[PDB]
Amino acid sequence: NMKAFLDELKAENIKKFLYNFTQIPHLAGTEQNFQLAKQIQSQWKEFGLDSVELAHYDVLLSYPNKTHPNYISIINEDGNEIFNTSLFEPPPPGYENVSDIVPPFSAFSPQGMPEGDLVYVNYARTEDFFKLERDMKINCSGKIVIARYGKVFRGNKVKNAQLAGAKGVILYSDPADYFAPGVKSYPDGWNLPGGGVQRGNILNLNGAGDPLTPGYPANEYAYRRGIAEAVGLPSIPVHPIGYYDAQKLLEKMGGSAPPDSSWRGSLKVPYNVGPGFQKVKMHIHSTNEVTRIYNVIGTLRGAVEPDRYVILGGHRDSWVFGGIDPQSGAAVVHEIVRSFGTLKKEGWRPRRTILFASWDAEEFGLLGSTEWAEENSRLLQERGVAYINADSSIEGNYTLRVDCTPLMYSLVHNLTKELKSPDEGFEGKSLYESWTKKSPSPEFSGMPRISKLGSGNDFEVFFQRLGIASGRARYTKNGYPLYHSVYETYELVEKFYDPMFKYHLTVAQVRGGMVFELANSIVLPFDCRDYAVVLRKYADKIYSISMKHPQEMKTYSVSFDSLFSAVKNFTEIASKFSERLQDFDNPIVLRMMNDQLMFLERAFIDPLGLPDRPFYRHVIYAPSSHNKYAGESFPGIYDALFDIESKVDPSKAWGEVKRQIYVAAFTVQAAAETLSEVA
Amino acid sequence: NMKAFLDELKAENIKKFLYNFTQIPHLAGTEQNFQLAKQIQSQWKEFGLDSVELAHYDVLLSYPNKTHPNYISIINEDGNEIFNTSLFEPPPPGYENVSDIVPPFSAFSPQGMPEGDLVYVNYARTEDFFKLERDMKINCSGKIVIARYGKVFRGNKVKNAQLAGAKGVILYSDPADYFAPGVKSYPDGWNLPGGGVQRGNILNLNGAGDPLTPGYPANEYAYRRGIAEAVGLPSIPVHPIGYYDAQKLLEKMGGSAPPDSSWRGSLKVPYNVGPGFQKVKMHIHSTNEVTRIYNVIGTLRGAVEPDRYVILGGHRDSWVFGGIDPQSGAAVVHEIVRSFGTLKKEGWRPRRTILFASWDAEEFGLLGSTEWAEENSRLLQERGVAYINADSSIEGNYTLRVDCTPLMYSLVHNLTKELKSPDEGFEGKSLYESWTKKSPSPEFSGMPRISKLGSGNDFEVFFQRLGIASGRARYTKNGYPLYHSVYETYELVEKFYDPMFKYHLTVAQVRGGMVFELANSIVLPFDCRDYAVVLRKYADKIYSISMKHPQEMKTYSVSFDSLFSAVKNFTEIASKFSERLQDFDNPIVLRMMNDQLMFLERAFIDPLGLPDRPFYRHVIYAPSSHNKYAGESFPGIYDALFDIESKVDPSKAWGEVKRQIYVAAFTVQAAAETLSEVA
Numbered sequence A, B: 001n002m003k004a005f006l007d008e009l010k011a012e013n014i015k016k017f018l019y020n021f022t023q024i025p026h027l028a029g030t031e032q033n034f035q036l037a038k039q040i041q042s043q044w045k046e047f048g049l050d051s052v053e054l055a056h057y058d059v060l061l062s063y064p065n066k067t068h069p070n071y072i073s074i075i076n077e078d079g080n081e082i083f084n085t086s087l088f089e090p091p092p093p094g095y096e097n098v099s100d101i102v103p104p105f106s107a108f109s110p111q112g113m114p115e116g117d118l119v120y121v122n123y124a125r126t127e128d129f130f131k132l133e134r135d136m137k138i139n140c141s142g143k144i145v146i147a148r149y150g151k152v153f154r155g156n157k158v159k160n161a162q163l164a165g166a167k168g169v170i171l172y173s174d175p176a177d178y179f180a181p182g183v184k185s186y187p188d189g190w191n192l193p194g195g196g197v198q199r200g201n202i203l204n205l206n207g208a209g210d211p212l213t214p215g216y217p218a219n220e221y222a223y224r225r226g227i228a229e230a231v232g233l234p235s236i237p238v239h240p241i242g243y244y245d246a247q248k249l250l251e252k253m254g255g256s257a258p259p260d261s262s263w264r265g266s267l268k269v270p271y272n273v274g275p276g277f278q279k280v281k282m283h284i285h286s287t288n289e290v291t292r293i294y295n296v297i298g299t300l301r302g303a304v305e306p307d308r309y310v311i312l313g314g315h316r317d318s319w320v321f322g323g324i325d326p327q328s329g330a331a332v333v334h335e336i337v338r339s340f341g342t343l344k345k346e347g348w349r350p351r352r353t354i355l356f357a358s359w360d361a362e363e364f365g366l367l368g369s370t371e372w373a374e375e376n377s378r379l380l381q382e383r384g385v386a387y388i389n390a391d392s393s394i395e396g397n398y399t400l401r402v403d404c405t406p407l408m409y410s411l412v413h414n415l416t417k418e419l420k421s422p423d424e425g426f427e428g429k430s431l432y433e434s435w436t437k438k439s440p441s442p443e444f445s446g447m448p449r450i451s452k453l454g455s456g457n458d459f460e461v462f463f464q465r466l467g468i469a470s471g472r473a474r475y476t477k478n479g480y481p482l483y484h485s486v487y488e489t490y491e492l493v494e495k496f497y498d499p500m501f502k503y504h505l506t507v508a509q510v511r512g513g514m515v516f517e518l519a520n521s522i523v524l525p526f527d528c529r530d531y532a533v534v535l536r537k538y539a540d541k542i543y544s545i546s547m548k549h550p551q552e553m554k555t556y557s558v559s560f561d562s563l564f565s566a567v568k569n570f571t572e573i574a575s576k577f578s579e580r581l582q583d584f585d586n587p588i589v590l591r592m593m594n595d596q597l598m599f600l601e602r603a604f605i606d607p608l609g610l611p612d613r614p615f616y617r618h619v620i621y622a623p624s625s626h627n628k629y630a631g632e633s634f635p636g637i638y639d640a641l642f643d644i645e646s647k648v649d650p651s652k653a654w655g656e657v658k659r660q661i662y663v664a665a666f667t668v669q670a671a672a673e674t675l676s677e678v679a
């Protein structure tokens, strides 16, 4: 049973694995990450899984030219390079003989050497550019943005800069965002040093996966698009830097003052917006190449319903050592596997099949999970019960953070009531109790906050494309300063985040317990009434956004009646379905009603996808078009409404709002009807 | 059991229903067809079904203007109308007081009054236009085609004419195609009189359904496209005529002689190609309007697997009386229903649920079946076992004609061995025996011909869009002369086609028996090895077509290795799966293996659809792009190869051939892998 599963999980084992996974870098496409794949595969076999395979793909990756390094310069009137940005981050104590630390770079930047005047765009959010071009009338065409990291996924910043006419982008970490007050830089605390730099990709893939093979797995015979028809590439060069290098570029900034204090970081600088101050010159030399990646897929066959899959997955590739991101998730998955395999060795099997995955190339655009899911989509869509992600277990040590589909709200509520809080001041009390005192829902009542799933991690294809119920759980802060830098080490974790490994252990219990229950409970632990509740809230919300335009709603006859009508029927049919679920015995009726619960998330998929994003097919949730990390509810209506006052042809824009209301109402009705009696 | 089902079916009942369904016209969108819907619904209730509902939709239909009739004219130098074509067909004996016989028209023609010179294009097939523009260098721009009916779906002719620059199309029935030697015109035989005219729509919908709501059901709150963004409308006027009116238009034809004898009909005319001879003028005045249609859906709940649906469906709407098309199919469905409901009344239930449908508006583009399937797609795709169509039971009286997915080849083989042939000279012998002596397969061996499913009938959405295994069966000739004319009456059927109603009865046994077996057999009666066999044949075929371009295949490295490799694995995995299907007991393993058989057809669906035809998603079969009625195998590769010697950029054209090989190979592999062990 479950308690046996949970008691077998040990903090010491997690620590031991984390140490083992973080001694060398494990960058996607390198031999070191292949070797770790082979190790994971051996150990998952010894741990007891029925099978463990490597699935490999040849996908577009991106690396810096080892002999022609990337950097940024200030240049004078005569073209001499008076300031050069660092070529590498200062390696942390004791790691100075590690080879193959990839220098800071923006994966997938095109090559180029643009010169021009700087403009400072704050976080390069959609609204930051709105402030620039609309209020301040500053024009970014032919300019070079600098933008600080924070708030939104860096791909969105680059996209916004492109559309504003920019010819390059420089990203940097501002200490207002990445330097927490009163704690020391690494190695003496967990803050970002001025030489530290955040790596990461800058693609705008919108669920496509490998940019060369959208729709189809990048296997041995795959037909690849030419690089110019590739999906999601930036067309301007991009490079990130630390805040020491950034102070040098920002201190000379002229032109307009910052519009208000929310544009000002905490470097001792004016934070003028520009343009200009001498010029800035980018040197970027990174190549794209097709490179083999390896997913490890472990199978633990179910005893009764082996054709029903519960998937626990997270990535293995890291930018550098991956002490938090991802090896603190991976070390948790490893111990979960060990523990399931221990039960299995004593003759136990879960009722449903469990798949365990170590994904590759997540850092480069979720490529490993996506290619695999493109290869196995027919299996996943007819047999896929649930996907639980397993990236970083900790990004802080304050409380639990859970993002999931409404179908798992009750499962998570119940599970955390049975678990001991690891928090200081809640010993004896339940994880539910600490989590809900520390992070209460705004949306009602005596309950913990659970957020919407956006994207930016490996659950994306499973949820947004295929409609498999998904969740994720980790310990969070009240990203983190050392995110995607060389300073993310084992030492960072043991010394400053989780010395006892008890937050790790709690996350392993939450992740492992969700999976256990999904794989073993007789009736699937999904509550469809939870979907009914949030659908009303999302419909109230999208309605209020529309009601900011009362005249247009009158003129174009914009009714939401059909959506509220669908949400009411969903509520009603969902009640009747839960009554039936309580009142029945009989392996056919059980299978039928489980298939209804399993397919309910599936019912929200529209095979035509959302407008211009064919691979985002969930009608209720999609990643925000302005921030891949954030989920948006009723995304088709929300985007049809966004900035609608600026459109040229209002009747066409409002026509499209109404079309999206119709699609959402139809889809909510049709979802509901999957829970009606079947005949 | 089955024999009980079959013995309850009576020829007299079929005759009785046919008579009842053919006394007045039942045109889609008229009150008469609504009344027949209500009648069907009452009777299916009295016959015993658990429920019977009307599902209605508001769809774009097309009617002639009652006060401004459509016609064609010859006009002289001064614009006087010297010949006018008939306004109506001479009504048959005894029906001259029937009101609301819709005059001949081409449903969905736009309005217009074009004048110009005639050009004669034979059947207006793709190759006919190739002969015109390529060999004979005749140019159809600003001209008016006339084309005879035959060979290909009339929508394709209109499309071909449009792309050739034509400004109007006149369709007519040539006696070489619609006047069988040695039999008399109606009412004294079954031939087309010179005043008879073939109605029918001329849309190019490619699976879209209602032209205003592609993707989504045309329900009460549907957002409709404007008519100018509508799907599949012709942009030139079209009108059909009989061969008396056609002789008048053809006799004066000048310009080039016909290129050979296959362009010559059997009117005593030269069959000159034109252009010119005086001019031709079209008067077309038909409107498009949104009109309510009604499907009747009957449910017979399954006793064990009520969440698994076997669907028997056919249309109810007719152009006029619908004596063959469709009421001879509908009268068969009615008796099948009666007969199932009789068993039900004696306490029996089928194992799986059976749905019975009387579709509306099939004649206008398969709109009734498609809208319903767009509304219920989530149900159909997770629960849909099979669809059997039930249009015209007879189009002749020579032998059986069966088109179906390979998955039903063995079911149909077995079923027809248990049925008595109704043929003259095969009394005592089996339907299998007559069918295979009369119509032997070219493709191998001692077996009857079974054709590929194309489209042009209500199975389209179920098979080509949703991937539900489908079939159809009817008696055929060695279309038929009176197709879609006023002369298609009950009398036509009783006097000349099937006086005893024994061909009807045989078709009711074949249709009803297929459904019985699908709904009641413990293991689904699908043989996946049958798919393996035809996949090799289709891959040999597509390969041979490519090998007509050996140089290009060398230059661009066009390999089919991946496809043959996928077909071999499918063959192998399909053998192993059938071994397992024989060797097992246990309601879970049974359900699992049935789900594997049910989803196998589903596995061939590509959610991105075929290029430019998003609603044709089956990778193995699609309607021919040159003839909606004909199925084409590996349609994505075949269309990438079609007329490839004429493309401007050969490396791009051959690039697209290879991409399609990759899609087909991936899809065959992925389909196969759904039949592998599940964990």
Ligand SMILES: *[C@@H]1O[C@H](CO)[C@@H](O[C@@H]2O[C@H](CO)[C@@H](O[C@@H]3O[C@H](CO)[C@@H](O)[C@H](O[C@H]4O[C@H](CO)[C@@H](O)[C@H](O)[C@@H]4O)[C@@H]3O)[C@H](O)[C@H]2NC(C)=O)[C@H](O)[C@H]1NC(C)=O
Pocket (backbone or CB within 6 Å): A562, A563, A565, A566, A569, A665, A666, A669, B220
């Ligand atoms: C939520 O669930 C309910 C089911 O309880 C469902 O209600 C349906 O609403 C539609 C109207 O929106 C109803 O449509 C009617 O159907 C009848 C036949 O039974 C027609 O005669 C009616 O048509 C006339 O009136 C229209 C409206 O003014 C006219 O425009 C039209 O031209 C006709 O004159 C009418 O269309 C439907 O019957 C009910 N079903 C019920 C009550 O069982 C509702 O739609 C669901 N919500 C969503 C978004 O799906």
Ligand SMILES: *[C@@H]1O[C@H](CO)[C@@H](O[C@@H]2O[C@H](CO)[C@@H](O[C@@H]3O[C@H](CO)[C@@H](O)[C@H](O[C@H]4O[C@H](CO)[C@@H](O)[C@H](O)[C@@H]4O)[C@@H]3O)[C@H](O)[C@H]2NC(C)=O)[C@H](O)[C@H]1NC(C)=O
Pocket (backbone or CB within 6 Å): A220, B562, B563, B565, B566, B569, B665, B666, B669
């Ligand atoms: C039909 O079924 C069979 C399964 O029985 C399946 O065979 C697979 O074929 C591919 C090759 O097309 C194999 O790929 C290999 O994988 C190994 C790892 O196990 C690699 O080391 C190999 O890579 C090297 O060689 C390549 C080819 O020259 C190089 O291009 C590459 O860069 C490497 O140097 C190789 O890729 C795969 O392992 C087998 N699986 C087996 C035999 O189990 C076949 O693909 C199926 N057909 C289709 C269309 O799916």
Ligand SMILES: *[C@@H]1O[C@H](CO)[C@@H](O[C@@H]2O[C@H](CO)[C@@H](O)[C@H](O)[C@H]2NC(C)=O)[C@H](O)[C@H]1NC(C)=O
Pocket (backbone or CB within 6 Å): A020, A023, A038, A039, A042, A043
């Ligand atoms: C991580 O742990 C594994 C196994 O516990 C270590 O890999 C083993 O290393 C020993 C000594 O070289 C060998 O006997 C085995 O062949 C290895 N097992 C494998 C690959 O499965 C691995 O060295 C540890 N990594 C580090 C850096 O400490």
Ligand SMILES: *[C@@H]1O[C@H](CO)[C@@H](O[C@@H]2O[C@H](CO)[C@@H](O)[C@H](O)[C@H]2NC(C)=O)[C@H](O)[C@H]1NC(C)=O
Pocket (backbone or CB within 6 Å): A410, A411, A414, A525, A526, A527, A582
């Ligand atoms: C979470 O736990 C609650 C309380 O145990 C569960 O709700 C009860 O479930 C039982 C078992 O079916 C019902 O008889 C009770 O009537 C339910 N009570 C309440 C308060 O609703 C709930 O089902 C659990 N959720 C899961 C496991 O998904």
Ligand SMILES: *[C@@H]1O[C@H](CO)[C@@H](O[C@@H]2O[C@H](CO)[C@@H](O)[C@H](O)[C@H]2NC(C)=O)[C@H](O)[C@H]1NC(C)=O
Pocket (backbone or CB within 6 Å): B020, B023, B038, B039, B042, B043
């Ligand atoms: C077709 O058959 C049906 C029923 O067998 C006939 O409809 C019935 O007509 C009688 C006499 O008018 C009434 O008592 C019933 O109300 C009708 N039943 C219905 C609508 O279900 C129908 O008239 C026949 N049609 C023709 C043209 O013969």
Ligand SMILES: *[C@@H]1O[C@H](CO)[C@@H](O[C@@H]2O[C@H](CO)[C@@H](O)[C@H](O)[C@H]2NC(C)=O)[C@H](O)[C@H]1NC(C)=O
Pocket (backbone or CB within 6 Å): B410, B411, B414, B525, B526, B527, B582
């Ligand atoms: C059609 O009938 C043939 C002959 O009865 C069936 O094939 C046999 O099926 C039985 C029952 O499972 C097997 O034990 C035999 O070995 C099969 N024999 C042959 C010649 O293959 C076939 O399964 C039937 N097809 C259906 C009902 O789909």
Ligand SMILES: *[C@@H]1O[C@H](CO)[C@@H](O)[C@H](O)[C@H]1NC(C)=O
Pocket (backbone or CB within 6 Å): A065, A066, A067, A068, A287
């Ligand atoms: C790295 O830089 C130099 C200069 O262009 C050259 O040797 C080599 O082509 C580069 N490597 C690449 C493009 O991968």
Ligand SMILES: *[C@@H]1O[C@H](CO)[C@@H](O)[C@H](O)[C@H]1NC(C)=O
Pocket (backbone or CB within 6 Å): A081, A082, A083, A084
């Ligand atoms: C920047 O680097 C370039 C190329 O190596 C060099 O010419 C220049 O001197 C450098 N500038 C400084 C200040 O070091």
Ligand SMILES: *[C@@H]1O[C@H](CO)[C@@H](O)[C@H](O)[C@H]1NC(C)=O
Pocket (backbone or CB within 6 Å): A190, A396, A397, A477, A496, A497
């Ligand atoms: C973890 O522990 C303490 C407890 O509040 C906290 O103050 C400290 O900042 C935390 N560590 C990190 C890295 O957030």
Ligand SMILES: *[C@@H]1O[C@H](CO)[C@@H](O)[C@H](O)[C@H]1NC(C)=O
Pocket (backbone or CB within 6 Å): B065, B066, B067, B068, B287
């Ligand atoms: C039928 O024709 C006449 C002339 O245009 C007119 O009375 C009426 O508008 C027409 N009906 C239509 C367009 O439905």
Ligand SMILES: *[C@@H]1O[C@H](CO)[C@@H](O)[C@H](O)[C@H]1NC(C)=O
Pocket (backbone or CB within 6 Å): B081, B082, B083, B084
């Ligand atoms: C054709 O019909 C028109 C309109 O009714 C009329 O003016 C003309 O006379 C007709 N031609 C003949 C030959 O009847």
Ligand SMILES: *[C@@H]1O[C@H](CO)[C@@H](O)[C@H](O)[C@H]1NC(C)=O
Pocket (backbone or CB within 6 Å): B190, B396, B397, B477, B496, B497
């Ligand atoms: C039906 O019966 C006879 C038998 O051969 C045939 O000659 C006749 O042409 C058939 N009827 C039709 C309409 O095809």
Ligand SMILES: N[C@@H](CCC(=O)O)C(=O)O
Pocket (backbone or CB within 6 Å): A200, A201, A362, A363, A364, A365, A366, A455, A456, A457, A628
């Ligand atoms: N999690 C990685 C990848 C995100 C993505 O490519 O969507 C990041 O946030 O950088």
Ligand SMILES: N[C@@H](CCC(=O)O)C(=O)O
Pocket (backbone or CB within 6 Å): B200, B201, B362, B363, B364, B365, B366, B455, B456, B457, B628
């Ligand atoms: N069966 C009808 C309709 C075909 C279609 O619209 O596809 C015909 O052939 O006219």
Ligand SMILES: [Ca+2]
Pocket (backbone or CB within 6 Å): A208, A209, A210, A212, A213, A214, A215, A216, A217, A218, A370, A371, A374
């Ligand atoms: Ca891909």
Ligand SMILES: [Ca+2]
Pocket (backbone or CB within 6 Å): B208, B209, B210, B212, B213, B214, B215, B216, B217, B218, B370, B371, B374
């Ligand atoms: Ca529609």
